[PDB]
Design a protein around this ligand. Structure first.
Ligand SMILES: [Zn+2]
Length: 258
């Protein structure tokens, strides 16, 4: 029927509604660290989030999105493998039912507890909906989360979850600073790919940071308390909302470091 993460509508089924699921530049992938090519021509990333304006947090039935005002160049990504400026539109996570799984990307087959996606769209295309139709329309920064110490900067997000527990719910979420979610180092791997959830459009330049951030066990526990279902529908915990690794096919993963 309609896509999700269960046994009957899970990733294995998406191709029937989204044929691009078996495309040539699908994501996520396993990052083989000994095959990735160091490319010294890649520039350091440039993250400009000082003027970021968060607006709202929404449970869309597959994850929770924090949305930003993208009507101007307030929170932008540039540099790295990118040509042009990409504006931040939303961030969201992928996580597991257990600490040993949850990330979309894997590193030498290692799965992390979660993966943060900061989604950016290429301003040359004028709006997000036009950008998804272009091979270089989106830039997604991916950050792995491992369970260890708490991440102070994530607590504001953890605390509002109770208020968007079910699908369709939203809450005002102003003045959140996404800079509190970055690791210390901006070293990354990059490859051409796609969105990891339907519509799976192949319009993404992935920028995967090498350094994971730490979250506490309690923090991740609160994610697992969200629901996939809408209010007054049988309870389905929002867990394991990650697509498994796809074939690399004819692609090369470049590294910004050695
Ligand atoms: Zn994602």
């Amino acid at each position: 029927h309609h896509w999700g993460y269960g046994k009957h509508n899970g990733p294995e089924h998406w191709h029937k509604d989204f044929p691009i699921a078996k495309g040539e530049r699908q994501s996520p992938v396993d990052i083989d660290t000994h095959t990735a090519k160091y490319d010294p021509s890649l520039k350091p990333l440039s993250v400009s989030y000082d003027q970021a304006t968060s607006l709202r947090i929404l449970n869309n039935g597959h994850a929770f999105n924090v949305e930003f005002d993208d009507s101007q160049d307030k929170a932008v990504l540039k540099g790295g493998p990118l040509d042009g400026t990409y504006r931040l539109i939303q961030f969201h996570f992928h996580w597991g039912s257990l600490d040993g799984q949850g990330s979309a990307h894997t590193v030498d087959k290692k799965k992390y507890a979660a993966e943060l996606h900061l989604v950016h769209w290429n301003t040359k295309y004028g709006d997000f909906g036009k950008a998804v139709q272009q091979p270089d329309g989106l830039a997604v920064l991916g950050i792995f989360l491992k369970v260890g110490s708490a991440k102070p900067g994530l607590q504001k997000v953890v605390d509002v979850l109770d208020s968007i527990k079910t699908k369709g719910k939203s809450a005002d979420f102003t003045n959140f600073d996404p800079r509190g979610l970055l690791p210390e180092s901006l070293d990354y791997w990059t490859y051409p790919g796609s969105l990891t959830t339907p519509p799976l459009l192949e319009c993404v330049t992935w920028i995967v940071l090498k350094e994971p951030i730490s979250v506490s066990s309690e923090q991740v526990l609160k994610f697992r308390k969200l629901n996939f279902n809408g209010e007054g529908e049988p309870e389905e915990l929002m867990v394991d909302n990650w697509r498994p690794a796809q074939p690399l096919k004819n692609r090369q993963i470049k590294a910004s470091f050695k």
